[model samples]
Target: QFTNVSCTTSKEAWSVCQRLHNTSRGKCMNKKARCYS
Candidate 1:
């Protein structure tokens, strides 16, 4: 989880992360979170 993203804001980011992870498959991780605007 992003330090800036709380539980509420994290929802959208989480969904994006999930989709990216699903499509990319073993790509998105804590290292390459890409959790920025």
Candidate 2:
């Protein structure tokens, strides 16, 4: 689902996923964590 994804900032990625996918903050943050950590 995120194959073509690109973001200038992690914050942008997190919020965009939150809005576009209707993701919970916890879930979104968790995925973003994986992306970074």
Candidate 3:
């Protein structure tokens, strides 16, 4: 399942967190995400 990860990046999540995470763009698609932060 997805999780709450604030002020973070997808690169770290997808590469390390290893979960079914997703997020919305804040300015240039660099917003928070659902994973480890």
Best by TM-score: 2
lDDT string for model 3 (1-37, tens) is 4444553544554532443434332211255444423
- All candidates' lDDT scores? 0.38, 0.42, 0.40
lDDT of 2 by residue, 1-37 (tens): 3423554445555655555555534222333431321
Q: What's the lDDT for candidate 2?
A: 0.42
Error of 3 at 31 (Å): 4.2
lDDT of 2 at 24: 36
TM-score of 2: 0.30
Per-candidate TM vs. native? 0.27, 0.30, 0.26
Q: Candidate 1's error at 36, in angstroms?
A: 12
Off by over 4 Å in 3: 19-31, 35-37
Ranking by lDDT: 2, 3, 1
Query: In candidate 3, which residue pairs get closer than 3 Å at backbone N, Cα or C atoms, i.e. clash?
Result: none
